[PDB]
Design a protein around this ligand. Sequence first.
Ligand SMILES: CN[C@H](CC(=O)O)C(=O)O
Ligand SMILES: CN[C@H](CC(=O)O)C(=O)O
Lengths: 257, 261
Amino acid sequence: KTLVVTTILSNPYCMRKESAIPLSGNDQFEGYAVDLIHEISKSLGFNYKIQLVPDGSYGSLNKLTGEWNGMIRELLEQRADLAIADLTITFEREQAVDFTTPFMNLGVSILYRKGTPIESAEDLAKQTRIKYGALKGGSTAAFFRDSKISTYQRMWSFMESARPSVFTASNGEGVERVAKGKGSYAFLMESTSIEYVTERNCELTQVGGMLDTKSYGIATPPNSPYRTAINSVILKLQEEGKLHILKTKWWKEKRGG
Amino acid sequence: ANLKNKTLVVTTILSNPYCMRKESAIPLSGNDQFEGYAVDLIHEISKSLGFNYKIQLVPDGSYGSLNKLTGEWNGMIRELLEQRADLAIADLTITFEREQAVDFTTPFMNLGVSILYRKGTPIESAEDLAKQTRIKYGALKGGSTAAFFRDSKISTYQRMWSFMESARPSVFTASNGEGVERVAKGKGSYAFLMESTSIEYVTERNCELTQVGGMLDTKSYGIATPPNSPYRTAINSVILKLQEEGKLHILKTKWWKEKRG
Ligand SMILES: CN[C@H](CC(=O)O)C(=O)O
Ligand SMILES: CN[C@H](CC(=O)O)C(=O)O
């Protein structure tokens, strides 16, 4: 059979491949997610077409309209069979689509300069000289805004009250603000992104662990007949080392893409 | 389906710091005799969903392995299949093999194999170990780490597996604690491959040991249920909410860094 796969550009999950000759179809794209679906399709014997989500969104719920956008909407409107991207499995998305077994685990962590005694979020919340922020309007900021845990409330109050603003318009802007800050600024974001950055900037490091836990998985329309088949392939690819090879390839070897 | 006012049997196994006997001047009874990460976790889940439960240690002291000759399971896996427990909460690895017999919830913890070694050597990775022969390296006999090496098709790990199987005297151990001691007393002559979470627990408590490199694979612990259990999806939602709020990370910090037994 032939499936439509929706995805979104995000380094190094799905990137446009550089080429002197113009590329078409699936060859336009490369990255971890591109390789992952290639391997899944080999096991299960389907063909597929990768299509970027036309609206450029992951999928959020309009809470007063009930409508989804992004890759989620493509699934629910029968324009994609699978969504394969750095798409976070959340209780909310699980109420509208199904998710496979995760292919990657991650969590909020801290990007900072190497070689200081700052070892944890707790070390940042106990001090006031170092400023710290996050992407404006993103899920990292929401983790802090929404928390009822005293530690993270104190941090959110500090972040919201800092001037100039500690929130950035992009993750890259936060990375650069750390890199040029001489320790005056730390940036909270996904641990997988931090690893991507620290593989490419020897002066930076992750600080502490993962303050939350979450995963990326493939999304399907509810009751898709392909979900359990993909779950088994994902576990098999994992247990033989194929996903480990793909992670190293894209985070450590392809210094870009 | 509904869990309010129900009483569940929960099987577990002693394993630090998931489930440990609590110290007390007076003997403790029932659930109060145990403490640890898994004990706190099931308490939280029970409060959210409104059920009661009794913790019972698995009688045969085993996690659950499949005898391929006979088809028989043992351990906590068997207790679920024989309907003598409703849930198994422990450091029980979600594997494809176990998934063909029982169900698992959403994972509560993610981990992977890594290296326990002495602090401050030139060894930086598994690749460094694999390309040399002077430093010996091993794992727990018959466990998930050994199965990972046995099942890897990656050249590095397949090479390591061949080396470990060939080494005389045996590099395998009967417990993780024996492996830890072999690293400590080995002064660099021995490295031990085991779960990253166990390496973290050890290195928090022995300052001369360290983790070398990252994870060589990925695997998770989840709550196991009888197949087709009507409670799995309700528990999944509770776990996802604890994960998204950071409460499992806080629980891990408590049992790994704050408490000592
Ligand atoms: C890279 N993941 C995006 C952004 C986020 O979760 O904050 C998403 O799944 O919506
Ligand atoms: C602590 N996990 C046990 C033992 C092992 O993985 O070797 C298991 O899942 O069987």
